[PDB]
Amino acid sequence: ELDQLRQEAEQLKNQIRDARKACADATLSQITNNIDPVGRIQMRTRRTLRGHLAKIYAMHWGTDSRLLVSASQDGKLIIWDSYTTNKVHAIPLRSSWVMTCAYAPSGNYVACGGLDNICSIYNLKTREGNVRVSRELAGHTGYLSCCRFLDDNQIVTSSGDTTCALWDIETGQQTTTFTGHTGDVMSLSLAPDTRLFVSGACDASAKLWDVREGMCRQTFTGHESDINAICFFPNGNAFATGSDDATCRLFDLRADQELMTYSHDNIICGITSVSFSKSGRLLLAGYDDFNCNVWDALKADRAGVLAGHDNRVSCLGVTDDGMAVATGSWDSFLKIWNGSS
Amino acid sequence: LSAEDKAAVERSKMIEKQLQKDKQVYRATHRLLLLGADNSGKSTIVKQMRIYHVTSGIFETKFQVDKVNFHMFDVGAQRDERRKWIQCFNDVTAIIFVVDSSDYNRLQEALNDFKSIWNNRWLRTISVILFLNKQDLLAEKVLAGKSKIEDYFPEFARYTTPEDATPEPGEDPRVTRAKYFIRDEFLRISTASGDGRHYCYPHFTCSVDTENARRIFNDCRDIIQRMHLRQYELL
C-alpha cells in the first residue's frame, strides 16, 4: 500500500515538473537585458538606535513609518521614534529569548514571541497609559519564529513545530491551523490583500496558504538549504526567499517556479533577512558576513553594499513609504540607512 | 523646543534611566544553558538546585551563589531538530552539557551531540561545562561486569589510565579507568578544534551532590578570568 502511494506521489511530482518545464519558455535574465542597469547604489546611515542590552533579533515597521518596534534577547521590546531617535516605549518581557516581534497596522497592539512558545500581545493605548500584557496565546509545541498582524483581532503566527496558526485575540484560540511543512518554519510574509500568506521552512521549500480556507496552494523547492527569510513582492504575485546556501531566489505565484537567482562567488555565508522596496526593483538581503547586499531584482547584480554592523545582520525592514531601511544586528545596534542625491 | 517635543525628551530620559538600571541588574546576573539527552538526569539536577538554591517551550531557574545570580534555561517543549533555536544561546555565560555515563549504547550519540555543539559556528566562543552524570550507576555497571565498554569502543582495550588521574581513595581501578576513558574521549573532541577561544570543563556528577552549582560558579569565574585574559591578549 505504501509503495503504491509513493509511486503515485512520484508520478504526480514528475507531472508537475514536466508542466513547469513546458511553461518555462524563457527566463527573466533573457528579457531583462534591455533595461537600464540601476548602477552602484550608495547609502548612508542617518540614525543609530542604541540602548539594547543584548543582540537585536527582529524588528517591524509601523504603518506610519515613524514608530518602529525592536526585540532584544535581553528581555526587552523597545518602540522607538525613528525621526527623533527617542524611545517611545520599553516593555519588559517575561521571556528573555524573544525571536520576533510584530506591530499592529492600527498601532494599538504589539506582539512578540520566542522560545517560550507563547505569543504575548501588549496594549499601547491603555486607560492609565501604562503598557501591560493584554493577551497570551498558547498552543504551539515549538519555538515561535515569526508573527504578523492581520487586524486588531486576528494574528498569524508561525512556530518551530512545522505549523502556522491564525489566532483570535478576543478568544485566545487557534482559529485556523496550517500544516504540511516538514522542516521548522522560520518566517512568513503577508500578501498585500492579506488573503494569502507565504511561509518558508528549513526543508528548502516554501508554501502558499489561504488565510480564510487553510490549505496549501503552491509549493516551491528551488533552494538547497534552510530558508531563513521570505518577503512578498509589492504587487503580491511573487516573493523572494533567502537561504543558508548563499543564494536568494525569486518565485512567482503564477509561474510556480524560480525566476531569478542571486548569488556570487565571494558570498558563502547564509542569508538571514530579505525585503523589497516599494517598486520591488531592489532586494535587500542581510548576510552573516556583517554586511547587507542590495541586488537588482531584474538584473541580478550586486547593486549596493551596506557595511555598518559589527555582527551578523539578524533582521531587515523597509518602511511603507520606503523612505529608509532599518537593519538590526547582533551587535545591539539598529542602523537606519537612506540614500542621497 | 516644542512642548510636546520637550515632553517626549523627558519621557525618553526616564526610559533611558530605567534602561540603565535594567542594564545594571542584567550585568550582575549570568545566563546558562542546560543541555542533555532524555536519559540524562537534567530534571534531578534542576530540582536539587531549586530546592537548595545555592506549551512551555523553555524553563528558567534562578539561583544565587555567593551573592551572584545565575539564570539556568532548560529546553522544554521543542522538536528533535535544534540547529536553529540554539543560535539564540550564542551569548550565554556557559553551557552545562549533562551526559549519562552509564548509557554505553547512547554514549556515541552524546559524543556526536557534544561534537556538534563544540563545532557550531555560533557556539565557537561559548565554553561548555561538561557533567558526566550518574557516576554511581557507572561504577555499579563496571563492577557488575556483564557489559563491557570494549564492545562499543574497541580502543578502550588499549587505553591506559592517565598518570594525572586523581581517583577516589576507595574507588575500584576499573571504574576510574572507565570514567577517565570517557573523559578523554570527550576531551579529544574538545581539543580537536577551538584554537583556545573556548574551553571545556569536565566534571563527574552524582546527580545528588550540592557542590555541582558551586562547581559551575567556579567554572564561570574561570571563564570570566580567561575572558579578561583574552581582552589583554595574555593567552
Epitope: 534552510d226 543558508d244 558563502i268 | 531538530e81 563544540w118 557550531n120
Partner: nanobody, 128 residues
Amino acid sequence: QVQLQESGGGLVQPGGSLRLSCAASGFTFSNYKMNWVRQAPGKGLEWVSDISQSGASISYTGSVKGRFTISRDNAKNTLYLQMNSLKPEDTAVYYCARCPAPFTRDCFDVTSTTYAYRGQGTQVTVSS
C-alpha cells in the same frame, strides 16, 4: 528539489560483503558533508560514518570502525559504502544524510526523526 536515492541491500549471509550506493540530485554534491545513518528494528536512528566535502576527514562510529569504508565521487555525485564482515546485529534501514548548510563541519540534526535532507534508505538484513 533535494532528493537522495539509495540502492543495495536485501538478505546477505553473515561474514559476506555488500555495497550501498547513494545518488544525489538537486544540489551541489561537492559542497556538503555526507553521513550514513542506520535505524535498527525496535531502535532509533544512530550515526554510523561521515565524510567531508573533499574526503580529507573520514570518521566512523565505534561499532563499525575498521569494518566499513565510505567514499564519494563528486563527478558522478555518488556516495559509496562498502561493508565487509557483516554481523547479524547490523540489519537496519540505511539512509544518507546531508549537512543542512554548505561549508559547515557540524552535522547538527542529521539524525532527526523527520529530517528532510535524507533519502528513503534501503533495508540491509544479515541472516543465515
